[PDB]
Design a protein around this ligand. Structure first.
Ligand code: HEM
Length: 153
């Protein structure tokens, strides 16, 4: 999937996200919600936010941010050996939350954006390459599980 050199890059970048999981989590979800308003409708607890200020002022949104990035970090530290960690995720987003694979695409892009925004100039081309490949692997493995379930939509 990835070489050990590329995994090394991913984990180096992840070190930036661990220094402020809540600020990073928050900005990823705001970037998603503002850029793709339909994603907001999948969250009954956040569908009430209409402005970004409101979003920025929501402590519950920062909390969910932490939950998401904690789960992602766990998976990335497995360097592709994440079947155990991913099956459950895949299963709940397909059967319970009914999240199209496309939104995983969106959040993937929103991570890259936020890293460039918070770390201008020290999110290099090699680092971007490794991070993108890692997210792709994650997305691909999810998609495999969605297929088994026939979560067509
Ligand atoms: C980077 C990928 C993602 C990660 C690691 C992630 C992680 C999580 C985790 C750990 C939970 C709580 C446990 C569970 O319900 O399985 C959760 C809940 C949820 N996720 Fe995700 N998620 C991701 C992507 C998304 C996307 C793209 C959407 C929607 C556009 C989404 C929608 C939801 C919803 C609606 C819930 C339930 C929230 C609640 O009411 O508490 N997830 N997610």
């Amino acid at each position: 999937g990835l070489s050990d050199g590329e995994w090394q890059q991913v984990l180096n970048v992840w070190g930036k996200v661990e220094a402020d999981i809540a600020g990073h989590g928050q900005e990823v979800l705001i970037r998603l919600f503002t850029g793709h308003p339909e994603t907001l409708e999948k969250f009954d607890k956040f569908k009430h936010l209409k402005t970004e200020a409101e979003m920025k002022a929501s402590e519950d949104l920062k909390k969910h941010g932490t939950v998401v990035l904690t789960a992602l970090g766990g998976i990335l530290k497995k360097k592709g050996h994440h079947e155990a960690e991913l099956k459950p995720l895949a299963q709940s987003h397909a059967t319970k939350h009914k999240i199209p694979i496309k939104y995983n695409e969106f959040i993937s892009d929103a991570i890259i954006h936020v890293l460039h925004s918070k770390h201008p100039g020290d999110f290099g081309a090699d680092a971007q390459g490794a991070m993108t490949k890692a997210l792709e692997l994650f997305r691909n493995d999810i998609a495999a599980k969605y297929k088994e379930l026939g979560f067509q939509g």
